[model samples]
Target: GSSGSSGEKLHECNNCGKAFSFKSQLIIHQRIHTGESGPSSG
Candidate 1:
């Protein structure tokens, strides 16, 4: 049940030294840089 444990950080951003563990986690991270939504969901 363990895909990785040591050095499992695969998702990393080029704009900054940010690393994410999952797909959506990385999306939200980059989205912060992508644009500024009105601070709420539609």
Candidate 2:
């Protein structure tokens, strides 16, 4: 993987192997996996 000046979704998913553009987007989508709102109060 080389550095490019093009649009790239660097946000990687540890569980779903997905790609996201924004950091918040990844965190929101990951909530479905654990239903904890990304390490929120249980």
Residue-by-residue lDDT tens digits, candidate 2, 1-42: 234533586797798667778899888888878756245564
- Write candidate 1's Cα lDDT for 13-33 as tens digits: 666667777868778788877
TM-score of each: 0.55, 0.59
lDDT of each: 0.69, 0.72
Model 2: lDDT to the true structure: 0.72
Off by over 4 Å in 1: 1-7, 39-42
**Considering every candidate listed, which one attains the maximal lDDT?**
2
In candidate 2 the C-alpha lDDT for residue 40 amounts to: 50
**What TM-score, to 2 decimals, does candidate 2 have?**
0.59
Clashing pairs in 2: none
The C-alpha stretches of model 2 lying farther than 4 A from their native spots are 1-7, 37-42
- Alpha-carbon RMSD, candidate 1: 7.3
